[PDB]
Structure 1
Amino acid sequence: PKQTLDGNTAAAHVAYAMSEVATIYPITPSSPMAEIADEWAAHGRKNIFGKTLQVAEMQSEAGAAGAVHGSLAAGALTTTFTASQGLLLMIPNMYKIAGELLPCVFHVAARALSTHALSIFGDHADVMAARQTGFAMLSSASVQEVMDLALVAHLATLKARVPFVHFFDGFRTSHEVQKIDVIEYEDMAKLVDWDAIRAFRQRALNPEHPHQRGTAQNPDIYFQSREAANPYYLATPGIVAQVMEQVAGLTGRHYHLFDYAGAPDAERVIVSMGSSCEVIEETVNYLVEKGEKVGLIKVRLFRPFSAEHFLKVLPASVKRIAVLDRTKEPGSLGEPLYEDVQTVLAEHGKNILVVGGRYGLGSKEFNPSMVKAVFDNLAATTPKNKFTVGITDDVTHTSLEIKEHIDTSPKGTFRCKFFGLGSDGTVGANKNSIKIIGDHTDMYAQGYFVYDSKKSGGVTISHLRFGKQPIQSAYLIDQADLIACHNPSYVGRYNLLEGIK
């Protein structure tokens, strides 16, 4: 059926169905996932095992991670929801969970890490800090993709014995409201490898067939024992590929480990991950229609990185690639995805000029005008490397210049902005209006809400979109068809009519 949900609810919907235990601890913007999971259990929602999910709150995410390990080692399918500083505290236990090959899915609303300052907003800094734990990592770019790929992870982790981190961009996706196709619990159970679940029960700690796990090992056997898990990681890409075909047969939506979009004879291709893929595909449609030979590679399965599946979707006409990372590793030669892309193309002797950039740190805006700038940098005589997009870096001169402002929104899409006052009901009303249009028309509906740091009396700006075509505009509204101001004080104070058509 069609419902209007956000990324958090889409993830919790699948996680609730596929899990018996969920140990949680609150952290923005992942706490809504655990909040709605608690309400569902209190109202008696059943999972695919016919029981309600048992939710246990710990004293910290470190305690949550330890509880997950114990619950998994004792024979219960367990998940958790976390982000940012919370994900860091779980990293020590993640090494154990991956090393012991326990099926598991962590759902992460990717959020910036506290460095020079705290930021509750979204980027991939937290997920990248765990890329060496041995967990698999799956990225969803839209609310619909959160629903589908969360199922992909839960099905694949049982088959591969490799735990998964399913992550989506904080706020930009976790709090983005969209009308999506919801997968029924009965349909999931038809795809589950029940043989894998029963095998997972036999490996559990039990006094009637006891075993020892987590021993201490000397140099004589530690190296070999660490390489004994090599077959499990080599087979994980093929398992994810086959699971993605199962979801394809059920939903009609085809995912691959790496997806390509754009001109088949493209010469400039952007490689990206997360919600940026939507903005880039929307821009690619606009540029390809304008005749430019550009393309986009969406990274779905980031770890383990399958070179075979990446090169299969890379056009032979590609001469220049720009890799965008939603993180910053100070002093590093490059960001994680840029180093991976540069490596695989080097291992296969591809004469492709690769350039890396950074974008969207702490939910910095990333709109189609910036995407064209990334493509324009690839078209320059000497493309700037190690760049930034979305800021003006007048100190180190890494920022790309936003030359012109373009409108790539598909024709027929309605766009509204609502300037409201803190807790006056505007946001709640817009949420209800999206549910109204989504339930009663064929139009796709999208809602995103800008909040203020002030707890009382702050300004709220709602961005709503409706159209006959799927809404890939994961960015603030550029040209609004309607602008509503619910507070007369804003007149003469803010540029309300900004960008109005």
Structure 2
Amino acid sequence: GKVRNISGCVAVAHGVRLADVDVICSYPIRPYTGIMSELARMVADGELDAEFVHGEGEHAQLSVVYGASAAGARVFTGSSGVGVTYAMEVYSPISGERLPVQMAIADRTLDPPGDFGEEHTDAECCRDQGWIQGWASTPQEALDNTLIYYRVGEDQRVLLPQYACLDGYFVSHILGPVDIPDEAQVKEFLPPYKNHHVLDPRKPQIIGPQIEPAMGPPLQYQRYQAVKGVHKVLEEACDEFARIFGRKYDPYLDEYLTDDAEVIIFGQGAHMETAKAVARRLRNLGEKVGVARLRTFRPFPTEQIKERLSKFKAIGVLDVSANFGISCSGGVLLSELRAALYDYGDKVKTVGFVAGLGGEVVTHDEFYRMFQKLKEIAKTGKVEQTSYWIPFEL
């Protein structure tokens, strides 16, 4: 389709428009606001026929699309920072009721104080809620993930809600080249939303009756199985997306120069692209470094990582978040990577880097200092401390 220079916000909106979303619930909060402004324009200019509900808050947003998805509509909403945490109560009801709601998250640091800069902290708080979750690093990927997560989420084998996350400002605001696909391609890729339950007087159902503790484990295990079936469906989706849209995505890891790398940096989102840039410049010096960008955060590709990242001497995990008090005092990505690569704990050295706090840019120099540390660790096999907080400790 037509290539245009657009922000990630507008890229998401085009993904929503092409998805022919039936109900959209809006509420403003920087830096995601632009997504709704663009959708409100499309509905006003007749580019998209959808119910544009002005939610009175983020908690209400997720509630509106909760009700709408149960009535059989394809829904869309989104938020940022405290807006994500404000609607926290509704996330679990949505997934446990198997409503494939999609929520876009342009990341923003949580209060306090006020800060419009991004952290992945806001979206990572929802990692237990039982949603599909991943980070887009480019405006192009933001559009693409929108279409992908709908297909995977609304898949009758899955029927789970999805978080389509993108870095605040860096992806959401900064204009980038995007290939906006055709409606014929999307209709070929995305089937109409059909659930196993719906609110319809002709076929009356009771959705969500109070249960006793004895009914606890089976229902919870029932959702557990739905989560573990996502990876298979995601793989089938990424192959379909490559065949229709011409862009081939890896469902788990976006690897760069890792074939003969001795140390790599692991993370997700926009800053990983800068890591690729620094890695390439460092190769010219002789340093054999690589980058592994996580494409799917939930459900965590534990095994895929175990067999693909266990061949490096050292792994530096970037956490653009403030996961306070966590094990090893890095971030969530570090803890879950170490958990995944537990068997090779003596051979593959791991350390965590915390940077990009409060939305601060993770500079090339900072990445260079990260790679130098990994170089030292790989040579000595000695990790003096499990985490480094940039730029105070490294």
> Could you state the TM-score of these two structures normalised by the residue count of structure 2?
0.93
Could you say what secondary structure the match of 1:38 adopts? helix
Could you say what secondary structure the match of 2:278 adopts? helix
Tell me the alpha carbon deviations over residues 61-87 of structure 1, each in whole angstroms, 9 at most, x when there is no partner.
111111111111111110102111111
Answer yes or no: is the 8 Å Cα contact 2:310–2:344 preserved in 1.
no
How far apart are 1:218 and its partner, in Å?
A: 1.3
Aligned pair in 2 of structure 1 residues 163, 264: CA closer, same or farther (>3 Å)?
same
Tell me the alpha carbon deviations over residues 192-224 of structure 1, each in whole angstroms, 9 at most, x when there is no partner.
134xx2x32x62111221111211111111122
Partner of 1:446: none
Could you say what secondary structure the match of 1:330 adopts? coil
Instruction: Indicate whether 1:108 and 2:121 are aligned.
Output: no
- 1:213 partner amino acid: I
Partner of 1:26: 28
Answer yes or no: is the 8 Å Cα contact 2:258–2:292 preserved in 1.
no
- 1:138 partner amino acid: G
Q: Take 2:287 and 2:340, find their aligned partners in 1: how far apart are those partners?
A: 26
- 1:277 partner amino acid: M
Tell me the alpha carbon deviations over residues 33-65 of structure 1, each in whole angstroms, 9 at most, x when there is no partner.
00110011000013xxxxx12210111111111
Which ranges in structure 1 are unaligned for 5 or more consecutive residues? 47-51, 394-398, 401-501
Could you say what secondary structure the match of 1:79 adopts? strand
Give the counterpart of 1:326 among 320, 330, 335: 320
Aligned pair in 2 of structure 1 residues 216, 181: CA closer, same or farther (>3 Å)?
same
Answer yes or no: is the 8 Å Cα contact 1:82–1:108 preserved in 2.
yes
CA RMSD of aligned residues (A): 1.6
Give the counterpart of 1:205 among 199, 203, 210: 199
**How many residues get paired?**
382
Higher helix share: 2
Percent identity (aligned):
23
Larger relative contact order (Cα-Cα within 8 Å, sequence gap ≥ 6):
2
Give the counterpart of 1:217 among 186, 195, 211: 211
Partner of 1:379: 375
Partner of 1:164: 162
Answer yes or no: is the 8 Å Cα contact 1:139–1:273 preserved in 2.
yes
Q: Take 1:347 and 1:216, find their aligned partners in 2: how far apart are those partners?
A: 42
- 1:282 partner amino acid: A
Q: Take 2:63 and 2:271, find their aligned partners in 1: how far apart are those partners?
A: 33
How far apart are 1:312 and its partner, in Å?
A: 4.1
Tell me the alpha carbon deviations over residues 291-329 of structure 1, each in whole angstroms, 9 at most, x when there is no partner.
22211111011000122322343262x011111111112
Residue pairs, 1:65-214, within 5 angstroms: 65-115=62-112, 117-159=113-155, 160-194=158-192, 197=193, 199-200=194-195, 203-214=197-208
Could you say what secondary structure the match of 1:27 adopts? coil
Q: Take 1:289 and 1:54, find their aligned partners in 2: how far apart are those partners?
A: 54
Instruction: Indicate whether 1:8 and 2:9 are aligned.
Output: yes
Aligned pair in 2 of structure 1 residues 359, 340: CA closer, same or farther (>3 Å)?
same
How far apart are 1:255 and its partner, in Å?
A: 1.3
Q: Take 2:76 and 2:362, find their aligned partners in 1: how far apart are those partners?
A: 31
Q: Take 1:188 and 1:309, find their aligned partners in 2: how far apart are those partners?
A: 29
Partner of 1:54: 51
Could you say what secondary structure the match of 1:167 adopts? strand
Q: Take 1:263 and 1:217, find their aligned partners in 2: how far apart are those partners?
A: 49
Answer yes or no: is the 8 Å Cα contact 2:319–2:353 preserved in 1.
yes
Partner of 1:285: 280
Answer yes or no: is the 8 Å Cα contact 1:284–1:294 preserved in 2.
yes
Q: Take 1:376 and 1:97, find their aligned partners in 2: how far apart are those partners?
A: 44
Which ranges in structure 2 are unaligned for 5 or more consecutive residues? none
- 2:184 partner amino acid: E
Could you say what secondary structure the match of 1:64 adopts? helix
Q: Take 2:246 and 2:201, find their aligned partners in 1: how far apart are those partners?
A: 46
Partner of 2:294: 299
> Could you state the TM-score of these two structures normalised by the residue count of structure 1?
0.74
Answer yes or no: is the 8 Å Cα contact 2:78–2:104 preserved in 1.
yes
How far apart are 1:347 and its partner, in Å?
A: 4.5
Q: Take 1:11 and 1:45, find their aligned partners in 2: how far apart are those partners?
A: 15
Could you say what secondary structure the match of 2:25 adopts? strand
Q: Take 1:167 and 1:148, find their aligned partners in 2: how far apart are those partners?
A: 12
Q: Take 1:355 and 1:348, find their aligned partners in 2: how far apart are those partners?
A: 14
How far apart are 1:352 and its partner, in Å?
A: 1.0
Partner of 1:448: none
Q: Take 1:56 and 1:80, find their aligned partners in 2: how far apart are those partners?
A: 10
Tell me the alpha carbon deviations over residues 326-375 of structure 1, each in whole angstroms, 9 at most, x when there is no partner.
11122222311111100000046662111112111222011221111111
- 1:324 partner amino acid: L
Q: Take 1:292 and 1:251, find their aligned partners in 2: how far apart are those partners?
A: 36
Partner of 2:259: 264
Greater alpha carbon shift after TM alignment, 224-233 vs 8-17: 224-233
Structure 1 segments (4+ residues) deviating >4 Å: 347-350, 381-384
- 1:181 partner amino acid: D
Q: Take 2:284 and 2:144, find their aligned partners in 1: how far apart are those partners?
A: 29
Could you say what secondary structure the match of 2:133 adopts? strand
Aligned pair in 2 of structure 1 residues 2, 375: CA closer, same or farther (>3 Å)?
same
Q: Take 2:306 and 2:216, find their aligned partners in 1: how far apart are those partners?
A: 34
Could you say what secondary structure the match of 1:134 adopts? coil
Could you say what secondary structure the match of 2:357 adopts? coil
Partner of 2:389: 388
How far apart are 1:139 and its partner, in Å?
A: 0.9
Q: Which has the larger radius of gyration?
A: 1
Tell me the alpha carbon deviations over residues 163-191 of structure 1, each in whole angstroms, 9 at most, x when there is no partner.
11001011111001012211222211111
Aligned pair in 2 of structure 1 residues 347, 133: CA closer, same or farther (>3 Å)?
farther
How far apart are 1:246 and its partner, in Å?
A: 1.5
Answer yes or no: is the 8 Å Cα contact 1:97–1:163 preserved in 2.
yes
Instruction: Indicate whether 1:243 and 2:244 are aligned.
Output: no
Q: Take 1:307 and 1:39, find their aligned partners in 2: how far apart are those partners?
A: 41
Answer yes or no: is the 8 Å Cα contact 2:326–2:332 preserved in 1.
no
How far apart are 1:95 and its partner, in Å?
A: 0.3
Greater alpha carbon shift after TM alignment, 145-154 vs 244-253: 244-253
Instruction: Indicate whether 1:370 and 2:370 are aligned.
Output: no
Q: Take 2:184 and 2:279, find their aligned partners in 1: how far apart are those partners?
A: 37
- 1:131 partner amino acid: R
